[PDB]
């Protein structure tokens, strides 16, 4: 159908339609009579899977010879998503499929919706780590994803009442053709025990064991031929394990005990839980990871060359026991030198922050390694020591700086600070956007940017434009294609010469039919899996991510709740319809978040049932929003909603795949924002609010949210109806928390920016009345995006962190 979804030539239909009779008879055992839509997903799964094995076997048999420099991306969480479309993508077999399919009597798009999300991450952290797979493996570089194979990736969401229930996860059920179990490559991780000093070095000895079994899941270039490898460890216990009846029984049961550890995904975003299982999670993947990483580089005795053959990325301080876990090996096991050890660990770690918010930031109880780890706490102690004494030679006599500096934390609890512990015995610190990264220098570590100002730098996040346009919005994709040719998809600089075709009257058309394309579509979603019903000529106003404060949902529920009162005072008056769409998890735990959940229920029963308002005000709430479900809401969307405090979004990525996929962004100037309004144009952009500077203005003064309230009647009306219960007539003071977090206790200071944002809103009205003009500037901002590749962040990690050059040449297929 479209050019961009490559060539349906006879040989290949005929090969791909047959391969799949095959599965569908040999691997499935089924036939036409009794097969259901999820054995037809299963034959295409089988079938497409079968045209990487050649590739990622040579790929990896390449690697082998050329010996290359590797990179290890370690990662708690790994946001992948759906395997299917992405690798017909990569593959170029996407029309042949789509054809072959056809001609069987099957709709893909259909075999499609069946796949389950590999849910293995939270939000932005975990799907960083996907698109950067994605770009390793099209930029040519010997990179392996690692983590762990959770059996339950984030729940699925319910709203039940208006409030998140949350169901297991469990996207293992109905198996995963995408993985490789390699049960051969077993590997012991040890826990507990205790340190035995001896004549020749310490020994940790009475541990338990536990094994790790890894699974290789292929992550395909694009049209590159290159397949590397995301390997992720699976939890075994020892067959001697807990070994009467009763007894014996019971030994075999408590096996679960051991694979408890990659059981369940930790759903808490932005906030740090002192759980050991969490700490257990950290140090399997750690452990058996850098066996594999040590054997795979003596099948290549002198750890010198180790750092010109490995790099090790922590993707934020979850890998970080890779430090010391490293320094345990090649000094207890290996029986190098301290000073030598710590030089091969520096020169092979780099590390990425992820936030400042201070609850984020990994402490654990020193009691805690003690009993876990006890090993690992000595080679703590000990990198702190030799830490403090080169900040102490540094700056003599400042004692606080030293005591700032420590990895070790003094208090009713000794904690071990993670990210003093990455800083130290990382050759590279690198923050996720420029504001983010400058942040980390002139504030929460500008303690090590003095001591070592040369281990910081930026690394400006990036999403992966195969999965976040050309999968998503193929429509937006080929009328691209059209004018500038293909090239770009794997190098997006080049929309840049899109601001050549701003004035170009069939191009606006065509950009603005894609768009009311994806409306129309998402709108039919939203009616048939939800039974909701959307005006599709209305504005799209989404804002979807994790709940959290700092993205102030609430700021966008104060909006939301301001144009129902105004349409309500003037009924009959003209305003531009807005369906508002709000997307997003809670973390269980997070009272607050899930308070805001229920408030957008709550607002969405009001004004969505009110005569008066009609088809000109929805208030929708996004259920069970992931990487799925992001990949339809985004292209139908006109309005990114990107409202954090300024200071509080490192970088955000959800931005980007909404201005690569034509929708406005209504902004602060926050995280990679910034960069955004840079590259388009701040004419382009709806910024509004307090930036970092007027953040910190505020704080010296102390931020009193009773004076907004006083001086803003539109403010005023809508905390009073809050409070009186217009929102929950039957349970009056249902949101009084909310109201009293407001007023009290805010910490994002919504009310400070609630003024610019109304404004600023009313100035995306008036832009949307005028199309031409609306699509025009869609056009500069789609025509910008070229920087915000993964691609290009990839290439900086590639030449500044890593030492490795990036190559866009093909492997023979
Ligand atoms: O720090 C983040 N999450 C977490 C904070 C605290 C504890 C966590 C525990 C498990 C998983 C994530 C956690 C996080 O999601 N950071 C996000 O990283 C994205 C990729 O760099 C950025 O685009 C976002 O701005 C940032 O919030």
């Avoid at 293992?172 to 051969?184: D, M």
Wanted: net charge neutral; glycine share 6%; aromatic share 10%.
């Amino acid at each position: 159908q479209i050019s961009v979804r490559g060539l349906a030539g006879v040989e290949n239909v005929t090969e791909l339609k047959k391969n799949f009779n095959r599965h569908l008879h040999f691997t499935l055992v089924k036939d036409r009579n009794v097969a259901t839509p999820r054995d037809y997903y299963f034959a295409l799964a089988h079938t497409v899977r079968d045209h990487l094995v050649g590739r990622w076997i040579r790929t990896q048999q390449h690697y082998y010879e050329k010996d290359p420099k590797r990179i290890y991306y370690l990662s708690l969480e790994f946001y992948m998503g759906r395997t299917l479309q992405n690798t017909m993508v990569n593959l170029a077999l996407e029309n042949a499929c789509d054809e072959a399919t056809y001609q069987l009597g099957l709709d893909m798009e259909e075999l499609e919706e069946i796949e389950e999300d590999a849910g293995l991450g939270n939000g932005g952290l975990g799907r960083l780590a996907a698109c950067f797979l994605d770009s390793m493996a099209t930029l040519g570089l010997a990179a392996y994803g690692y983590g762990i194979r959770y059996e339950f990736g984030i729940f699925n969401q319910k709203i039940c009442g208006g409030w998140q229930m949350e169901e297991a996860d469990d996207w293992l059920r109905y198996g995963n053709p995408w993985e490789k179990a390699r049960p051969e490559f077993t590997l012991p991780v040890h826990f507990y025990g205790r340190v035995e000093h001896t004549s020749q070095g310490a020994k940790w000895v009475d541990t338990q064991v536990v094994l790790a079994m890894p699974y290789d899941t292929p992550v395909p270039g694009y049209r590159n031929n290159v397949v590397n490898t995301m390997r992720l460890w699976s939890a075994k216990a020892p067959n001697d394990f807990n070994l009467n009846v009763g007894g014996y029984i019971q030994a075999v049961l408590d096996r679960n005990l051991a694979e408890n550890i990659s059981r369940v995904l930790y759903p808490n975003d932005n906030f740090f839980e002192g759980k050991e299982l969490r700490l257990k999670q950290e140090y399997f993947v750690v452990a058996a990871t850098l066996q594999d990483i040590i054997r795979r580089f003596k099948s290549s005795t002198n750890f010198d060359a180790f750092p010109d053959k490995v790099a090790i990325q922590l993707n934020d301080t979850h890998p970080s026991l890779a430090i010391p876990e490293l320094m345990r090996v090649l000094v207890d096991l290996e029986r190098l030198d301290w000073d030598k050890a710590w030089e091969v660990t520096v020169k092979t770690c780099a590390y990425t922050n992820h936030t400042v918010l201070p609850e984020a930031l990994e402490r654990w109880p020193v009691h805690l390694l003690e009993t876990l780890l006890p090993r690992h706490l000595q080679i703590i102690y000990e990198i702190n020591q030799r830490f403090l004494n080169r900040v102490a030679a540094a700056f003599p006599g400042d004692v606080d700086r030293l005591r700032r500096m420590s990895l070790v934390e003094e208090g009713a609890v000794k904690r071990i600070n993670m990210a003093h512990l990455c800083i130290a015995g990382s050759h590279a610190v690198n923050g996720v956007a420029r504001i983010h990264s400058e942040i980390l220098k002139k504030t929460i570590f500008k303690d090590f940017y003095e001591l070592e100002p040369h281990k910081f730098q930026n690394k400006t996040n990036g999403i992966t434009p195969r999965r976040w346009l050309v999968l998503c919005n193929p429509g937006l994709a080929e009328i691209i294609a059209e004018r500038i040719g293909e090239e770009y998809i794997s190098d997006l600089d080049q929309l840049r010469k899109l601001l050549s075709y701003v004035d170009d009257e069939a191009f606006i058309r065509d950009v603005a039919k894609v768009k009311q394309e994806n409306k129309l579509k998402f709108a039919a979603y939203l009616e048939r899996e939800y039974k909701v019903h959307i005006n599709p000529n209305s504005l799209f106003d989404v804002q979807v991510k994790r709940i959290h404060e700092y993205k102030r949902q609430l700021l966008n529920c104060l909006h939301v709740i301001t144009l129902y009162n105004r349409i309500k005072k003037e009924p009959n008056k003209f305003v531009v319809p807005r369906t508002v769409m709000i997307g997003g998890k809670a973390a269980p735990g997070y009272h607050m978040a899930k308070m805001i959940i229920k408030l957008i229920t709550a607002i969405g029963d009001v004004v969505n049932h009110d005569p008066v308002v009609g088809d000109r005000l929805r208030v929708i709430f996004l259920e069970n929003y992931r990487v799925s479900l992001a990949e339809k809401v985004i292209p139908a969307a006109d309005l990114s909603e990107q409202i954090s405090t300024a200071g509080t979004e490192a970088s955000g990525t959800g931005n980007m795949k909404f201005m690569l996929n034509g929708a406005l962004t209504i902004g602060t100037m926050d995280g990679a924002n910034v960069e955004m309004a840079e590259e388009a144009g701040e004419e382009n952009f709806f910024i509004f609010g307090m930036r970092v500077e007027d953040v910190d203005r505020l704080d010296q003064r102390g931020y009193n949210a009773q004076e907004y309230y006083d001086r803003i009647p539109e403010l005023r009306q809508i905390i009073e109806q809050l409070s009186s219960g217009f929102f929950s007539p039957k349970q009056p003071d249902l949101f009084k928390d909310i109201v009293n977090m407001l007023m009290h206790h805010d910490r994002f200071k919504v009310f400070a920016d609630y003024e610019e944002y109304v404004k600023c809103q009313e100035r995306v009205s008036a832009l949307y009345k005028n199309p031409r003009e609306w699509t025009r500037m869609v056009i500069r901002n789609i025509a910008t995006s070229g920087k915000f590749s993964s691609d290009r962040t990839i290439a900086q990690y590639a030449r500044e962190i890593w030492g490795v050059e990036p190559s866009r040449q093909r492997l023979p297929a």
